[PDB]
């Protein structure tokens with residue numbers, strides 16, 4: 001594990017603690033979210049982020065932050081502001097960026 005892998009594994013653990021239900025743990029499917037893949041061009045989830053760390057696909061903290069923001073932005077695009085997914089996406093986006101300083 002490279003230094004960047006160890007730091008991103010730390011950040012991901014801290015970010016997932018903010019999603020105790022694991023709403024963001026796995027990819028959203030069109031089966032449970034009608035039209036999701038037609039509205040969201042670039043899906044992201046914490047599970048895919050873990051796999052990218054393990055594969056050493058993140059070469060900067062900026063790239064990891066961009067995937068976290070994408071995951072949150074996707075939830076705030078597909079879902080209405082009154083929904084659990086939208087409200088948690090917004091909360092963890094701000095708290096996560098603050099946490100990662």
Ligand SMILES: Cc1c(NCc2ccccc2N2CCN(C)CC2)cnn(C)c1=O
Pocket residue numbers: 022023024026027028029032033036074075078079085
């Ligand atoms: C983050 C998110 C979701 N996260 C949860 C989620 C993600 C992937 C697969 C299933 C689930 N749901 C878990 C809770 N169940 C009540 C429904 C199925 C689901 N739908 N949408 C549209 C989202 O944006």
